[PDB]
Design a protein around this ligand. Structure first.
Ligand SMILES: [Cl-]
Length: 125
């Protein structure tokens, strides 16, 4: 029945300086960004403001300076049993993508009710 966005989160995904001893590949790390969310249900607008968390572990001071709105991993939480689909040129959730502009999504409820959502994300450096 419900086709809502309930949360908008983001990660900075990056190559740590560590290498796998067998494959020789650089190991990937991910850091969740701090957030504020503004969910406007009436207008189907989900807004998030991300801030860069303090340095720690492989998320060094140098890596904090690499966090970019043009290459951000965004994820959403939706209503129980709802399915979200990107519209037009919208990036997929869970993949590094350009989030400098807002993007539209179709959220489909368990009963098949569809609701168009606009996701708008900013980064405060
Ligand atoms: Cl984290």
């Amino acid at each position: 029945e419900e086709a809502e966005i309930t949360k908008v989160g983001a990660y900075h995904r990056f190559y740590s300086g560590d290498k796998d001893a067998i494959t020789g590949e650089n190991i990937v790390a991910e850091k969740e960004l701090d957030r504020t969310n503004n969910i406007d249900s009436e207008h189907g607008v989900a807004t998030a403001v991300f801030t860069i968390p303090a340095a720690g572990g492989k998320f060094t001071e140098a890596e904090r300076a690499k966090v970019s709105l043009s290459n951000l991993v965004v994820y959403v939480n939706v209503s129980t049993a709802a399915r979200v689909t990107p519209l037009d040129g919208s990036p997929k959730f869970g993949v590094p993508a350009d989030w400098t502009r807002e993007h539209k999504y179709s959220v489909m409820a368990a009963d098949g009710t569809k609701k168009i959502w606009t996701v708008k994300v900013t980064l405060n450096k």
